[PDB]
Design a protein around this ligand. Structure first.
Ligand SMILES: CC(=O)O[C@H]1[C@H](O)[C@H](O[C@@H]2[C@@H](O)[C@H](O)O[C@H](CO)[C@H]2O)O[C@@H](C)[C@H]1O[C@@H]1OC(C(=O)O)=C[C@@H]2O[C@@](C)(C(=O)O)O[C@@H]12
Ligand SMILES: CC(=O)O[C@H]1[C@H](O)[C@H](O[C@@H]2[C@@H](O)[C@H](O)O[C@H](CO)[C@H]2O)O[C@@H](C)[C@H]1O[C@@H]1OC(C(=O)O)=C[C@@H]2O[C@@](C)(C(=O)O)O[C@@H]12
Ligand SMILES: CC(=O)O[C@H]1[C@H](O)[C@H](O[C@@H]2[C@@H](O)[C@H](O)O[C@H](CO)[C@H]2O)O[C@@H](C)[C@H]1O[C@@H]1OC(C(=O)O)=C[C@@H]2O[C@@](C)(C(=O)O)O[C@@H]12
Lengths: 642, 634, 642
């Protein structure tokens, strides 16, 4: 029975015995066990005393309120298998390292305040790359379940990881730095026969790992199974105390790092210039790791930065406000030497970005199997969404009021895919995939200079309004870029008092005949469905099939007399030779409804367009139906398309 | 009695026994008695020693639980069955977590609210110093006009009307924002906001701003309100969880039951969960049974609200975004940015999933309504978007808009066995993209817009019904393209409603599969003069006798084929004929221009045989002997 | 105050009295109360002592570190209303049963290691079927909110459950075993009038329950409200210790069973043959139950198996590696007698499967309202996704490198629905719905022998490349299967140096006229857009409307002279009679642009195609526009389609 009113009196007591019941009162109070066994002092769970150590008695988590200082918290978390609840406002004076099979959980009032004296990292989860590699014993193609090495070359242990690499270049995108391939894999099976060890992997290989590329494998040091529950890093008012940090949570060679909720604030001043490298959360070479629900304010660089061979990474439900990019998959500069790894299998879902200084959601020029689902960007100073790697897919994403494009690719980038994406009031365009093609499926763009900028690919379905120049702008980033075929099919791009339907950019070498336009609603554009600029000679039009140009005077029945009838209808065309124009006329579909013996072959001729001044009346436009038989008295149904 | 012991000292270790037992510290410093963590004793107080959460089993009474939670910064685990006798208020930075057996049973003496999370509107407003357009990051006020503290909130409003929908009450705009930066220069304070403004806030609309006192960062883990059998004990409540001026309120799982008797009449206002002027707040996984009004009610300027994974059974609406009656004076705020995802509703007395006539950026994703007494889904604000939602067995429409409501958007939504229609957007247009409706009177009722893709079957009247709610509603252009609307022994493909003034020439029909309807692809009623048909391009009407090769002899060939047409003058009919595409396959010197004539249709007496229908290919050159490919479309 | 240093000392003490304050120091330590009331000994929370029992005093969860042995853990969880945190490595020697209103939660080091001596089940959550049934008093149609029974036949308590069944057969799929219908429902209201009890249900009925099918109802015993937080069953290295199990988590007649995260490993050796029945998680007759986040390695049977009348089941975010199927909805063999129940309302979302020995994601031939959303299968030894019940829906799913088909139905199975699904490098096909039709909407298949195999239905939109035989293969599983109409519309199926656009399989009786092809991009295929085999007489072609076959020489303007003009253009056709070929020609759309008095009806003739060897030159192809008027001098716009 030993009770102490304060810590100093408890730890000075010389007579502790192993059988004593020991109690401390006050803010870090609790019950303790005396031992002579060497114990790791942290002044929270273990205290030094004369003749031994006091160990706090507890089950379940430890609490930050038990600790005398930050240094002790660091000591405690330097071991694996820790569960610490941050129930106090901690003042960091160093990085907090978290080790495997550990949980750091915050109560609603728990905080880590970074050091105002020195900008540094706050939480680190730090493995490392192998120091030594061994060659594969044989080529391992993409899809391989097993890799092979010489028997005894590598100590592969089931449940631990391998890091594979070769000189093959990352292939997700343009890869201008020439980053080389790597992947992290878990060992799940081992067998040895004929001097070769076959190592079965959790997941299959996503490139060919060939001996001609010096394919090799080593054992990384991973930090696995770390859970960060509601991390609260910094606090509002930080800027008045000059209290910043560099990277909030930095992970390297982590597996199953899961970050839930929390708020990370203030590694730059509010609204201030970007600061290179100062991301809130950084996943470098991390596998099966996620961020879900976290909020970000006033961040110098990226909210969530994903790089190296980070694989099966997901970001859900984040809110990022005043950051450079909310999410950015990154490249690695090879200016000072080789680098390995591109992200593989990335999901961003239900994320929100406001007032990003650069793209809301971003990739650089490497990365594979990147998907954004139901994300939204508001008021970006650049694009809402930027793809710089090939074939990035966007499902039901939305971009509002980007200063440039709602959604864009960039120089050298191939065929982003936009499905049911919606773009509102972005200044330049809704979708800009004029760099290297795009697939724009059932998308909408409203309130831009042009709805879609595109050099090739497909615009299928969707709906476009309030675009001042045109709904679709067939153009390029630069004239040197190749135009490819463009299908525009099933698109609603009606006249609403704003721009034209389609703008063909002769200035950069657009050939309109590489465009095909079928079954589009172009109602109301009249003679001004197309805009053309920069043509030296009148170009040939796109192929056009069964588009709608008018909604009145577009179907009826005429009765031939002596093989002819004149029909008033909104038939349309241009027969001039002006360089920035097309020569074209309506497709008038004719079907015979009575069957006299004088039935002949039918044609449209004598297209006349009323040119009353001041303003033309298109209901007095007309065409003639003429029969090859001069006695024809057939009733003929007529239908007017573009 | 521990609370009677006269000679307590600060030095003591103290122990209570029993169901609320534990270790205690004596103190003289002032403390709020709750008879669970703080007890009054002679000359001072006993404070329970603990780390981590408090437990309801520590408390002598409900009133003590209420006192405990009346402060912020509380974590309480409900590990017992609590009997309420008053409202439980929850304050900022607090968590209320329920164990497997913990419950709050409502007050049986007074039907009242169970949980309240209530911030307050500003007590004073100041005018904006300058116009702030939609998209503004910063607002301005006169220097000294108010004190904007970083991390706290502002409430903006003006006389501009909410613009998400028809807004028949004339609710005015408001939004809640967080202050993230402040600077003052030249007599003007510039306040940087977390999120940008979603309306123009103009001096001419008396745009103004004030400081609300928000309740922020509240987590309700598995709330269990009431229990089965409540009705035998006549034990009800009014609103289960009512929140107003809350930020980051997150409700996870739990079960809320019984503010009406099972299957009983609805009761105005008795929603299970109500979010009024809440920002960044969510309901995920909660189950609802026997609710007099809405499962989750969302109103005021609630912004970035989400409801995921709920199950609601025997409620008025599972989710309803609400208006505010202005009968007694001005009101402000419409919901902005709402997501309902993976929610399920059964046996709703009104629409399964609902909005009233305001609200912006409202999305339902993979929600399902079963056996609604009204619609599965009802949109009363403009441009509500539905992604992969499903409606089964609604008594009226699977999905519907309503009077004056513009263009809901349905993407890959599926409607099964709804009595009246799958989709009813006949009030003000709709966009029906790759949807399906099966088992109704009409698959889609629509006055204008687009039906693109999708598949329709088992609709007794027609797959598509071109009609209006009332004759005074404007018909607009309608595109029907790429739709599978085949004959399956039930209704026709498209019904044109002459009674309400439908002009079929405003409809365009391209590349649809109308196989099997024969002469009965269209239904018409209410016409007194034969209307002109829609434009029609390359639709499929028959699957047999629809392609071949003919050889002209002396400029002509008679071809047996399923060519079709109507050439009569009956008011409720169209004059039309097949589009027969002709292509020449051999190239004699006598090649001339080709045409279709002499369309003849078999009239065999029990049942006509359309394989004996025919047409003639005739050339302008009477010697033409060309081989000619023919293809029959509608 | 009674204080003890060790447990043996404490439980041997002969003189305990109810008023004693009792403390155990050290291991499994804490505070205790003595009682004479019969208590269930578990050597963790309850200990036998002379004259009665010691009960541990605590609030919040129990901990496995309190218990002397596994047997005690089992005893503790044998009662309902338990919260146990597994904070130690437990060695199982028996099945752990979990009862209602209970939570079993694992810390990062907590584990249950199965018994190496005997393969058995690890966790069981086991209710039971009714012991007695009563007939319904009246027919209850699908959609019924209420069922009726004779007053007094059964006592239906609000908040408890009912189990309904009849002799009607399950109707979700082919149901070759003749499994009969059942459902589980919760009672929410009861009233009795005129000798009839009306029972109001939580959810409506999904079949017609008829007296003529012997419709009946009984009270099952359910295990309700069980939460398993991060279950860790077995560990890597298990195979070196021959340490396996049968079923990891087996549930029957459970409601609101929610399993979160965790890892289940090793009921077979890594890469070994499948073992029938050894699923990781099994939900039989479970309602409102979910698996979210769990990882699976080296499983003999299914990752998550769903069977019986399991209703409103969801599987989210799982990773399954080296299993038979990641998810499988199952039938029930009726070889030894009747069985009841098919799954109803199933969602699989954001799940990943690697190296499955059979289909990645599977159903058997029953089940209703089954949906997979954003799931991905890699490197399956069979299909990526297999549907054996009717109308399974797939949204944005992906299949890579399946040994057979990315996505497939099977014998007798109707119309799976694929929306925006993507298939890469699957050996045989991307989509194989040739057994009973399919709906293939905006899908993509790349790197297969054929992109889509299909006998009827719709291929609408989407994009197909790098398919060695053809992009679309119109075929059947067996000749006896009915061909139905097939619509191919809006599909990008261009020539890229690989296969043809569409292959018509005459061998199995395909009539190409049942196929219609509109507005497809077939650019580059030339005369080789179709493959045909097995025809003995030349078949008639599909209907074709406004497809794209060439990208150059496809639009221009000709000027007639004396009623004719020769036009150089990439017009195409075949006029031969070879059995495995079509007779066809380009659709050339002609529109008049000038209107001379000599305007006549216009036609295409004299199609001429260059046949240079080795390489034909399509820039030398031509056709003639001829007018019915011999003096016609019209300018005529021409456009070349297929
Ligand atoms: C590992 C590393 O070098 O990280 C990069 C980081 O990704 C970032 O790279 C930028 C990239 O975002 C940009 O788009 O392209 C540039 C190349 O053209 C590239 O430089 O920023 C640089 C500075 C690196 O960031 C540093 O990384 C780490 C770390 O621990 O991983 C610490 C450094 O701290 C600061 C803030 C710093 O010391 O300046 O930058 C961090
Ligand atoms: C919602 C549903 O149960 O639909 C039933 C539909 O009502 C109909 O029921 C039949 C009824 O016509 C017949 O007379 O009695 C039968 C036996 O009791 C009864 O089954 O048809 C069946 C096939 C159901 O319709 C299918 O149901 C569902 C579903 O989720 O329940 C989806 C199917 O999609 C289609 C359109 C299809 O593709 O065939 O049919 C739906
Ligand atoms: C309840 C039951 O009988 O379960 C089946 C299980 O679903 C599985 O059935 C297979 C099915 O997967 C396959 O596709 O079709 C087969 C019929 O053709 C069918 O047999 O496997 C069988 C063996 C049953 O599994 C057993 O179920 C249970 C249980 O508790 O539910 C325990 C048994 O343990 C083993 C591993 C065993 O004893 O072998 O199998 C389990």
């Amino acid at each position: 029975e030993r009770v102490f009113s304060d810590l100093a009196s408890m730890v000075a007591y010389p007579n502790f015995q192993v059988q004593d019941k020991i109690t401390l009162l006050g803010s870090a109070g609790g019950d303790f066990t005396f031992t002579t066994t060497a114990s790791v002092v942290d002044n929270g769970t273990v205290f030094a005393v004369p003749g031994g150590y006091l160990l706090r008695k507890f089950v379940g988590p430890a609490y930050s309120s038990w600790f005398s200082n930050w240094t002790g918290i660091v000591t405690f978390m330097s071991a694996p298998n820790r569960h610490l609840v941050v129930d106090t406002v901690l003042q960091a004076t160093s990085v907090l390292n978290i080790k495997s099979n550990s949980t750091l959980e915050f109560t609603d009032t728990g905080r880590i305040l970074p050091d105002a004296a020195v900008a540094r990292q706050v939480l680190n989860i730090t493995g490392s790359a192998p120091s030594v590699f061994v060659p594969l014993a044989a080529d391992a193609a993409a899809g391989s379940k097993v890799i092979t090495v010489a028997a005894g070359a590598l100590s592969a242990v089931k449940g631990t990881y391998l890091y594979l690499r070769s000189n093959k270049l990352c292939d997700g995108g343009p890869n201008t730095y020439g980053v080389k391939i790597s992947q992290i894999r878990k060992v799940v099976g081992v067998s040895t026969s004929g001097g070769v060890t076959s190592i079965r992997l959790d997941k299959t290989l996503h490139y060919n790992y060939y001996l001609s590329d010096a394919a090799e494998v080593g054992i990384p040091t991973m930090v696995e199974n770390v859970t960060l529950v509601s991390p609260y890093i910094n606090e509002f008012g930080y800027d008045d105390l000059n209290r910043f940090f560099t990277i909030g949570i930095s992970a390297n060679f982590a597996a199953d790092l899961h970050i839930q909720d929390g708020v990370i604030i203030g590694n730059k001043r509010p609204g201030a210039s970007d600061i290179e490298g100062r991301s809130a959360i950084k996943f470098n070479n991390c596998v099966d790791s996620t961020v879900k629900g976290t909020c970000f304010y006033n961040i110098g660089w990226y909210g969530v930065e994903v790089l190296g061979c980070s694989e099966d990474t997901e970001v859900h439900d984040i809110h990022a406000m005043d950051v450079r990019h909310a999410i950015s998959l990154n490249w690695q500069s090879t200016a000072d030497g080789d680098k390995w790894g591109e992200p593989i299998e990335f999901l961003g879902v239900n994320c929100e970005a406001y007032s990003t200084t650069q793209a809301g959601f971003d990739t650089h020029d490497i990365g594979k199997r990147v998907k954004f689902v139901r994300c939204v960007s508001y008021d970006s100073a650049a694009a809402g969404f930027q793809a710089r790697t090939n074939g990035v897919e966007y499902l039901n994403c939305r971009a509002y009021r980007a200063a440039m494009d709602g959604f864009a690719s960039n120089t050298g980038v191939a065929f982003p895919i936009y499905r049911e994406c919606l773009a509102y009031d972005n200044v330049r365009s809704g979708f800009n995939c004029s760099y290297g093609g795009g697939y724009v499926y059932d998308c909408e763009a409203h309130g831009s200079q042009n709805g879609v900028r595109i050099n090739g690919g497909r615009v299928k379905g969707g709906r476009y309004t309030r675009n001042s120049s045109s709904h679709i702008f067939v153009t390029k980033d630069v004239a040197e870029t190749a135009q490819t075929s463009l299908e525009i099919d099933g698109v609603s791009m009606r006249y609403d008092g704003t721009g034209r339907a389609v703008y063909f950019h002769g200035t950069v070498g657009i050939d309109p005949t590489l465009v095909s336009m079928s079954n589009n609603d172009m109602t109301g554009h009249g003679l001004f469905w197309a805009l053309l600029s920069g043509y030296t000679v009148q170009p040939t039009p796109p192929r056009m099939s069964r588009n709608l140009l008018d909604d009145t005077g577009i179907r009826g029945v005429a009765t031939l007399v002596a093989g002819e009838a004149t029909v008033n209808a909104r038939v349309r065309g241009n027969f001039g030779s002006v360089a920035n124009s097309f020569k074209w006329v309506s497709e008038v579909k004719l079907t015979r409804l009575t069957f006299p013996s004088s039935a002949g072959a039918l044609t449209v001729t004598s297209v006349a367009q009323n040119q009353d001044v001041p303003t033309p009346n298109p209901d007095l436009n007309s065409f003639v139906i003429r029969s090859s038989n001069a006695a024809d008295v057939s009733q003929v149904a007529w239908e007017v398309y573009l």
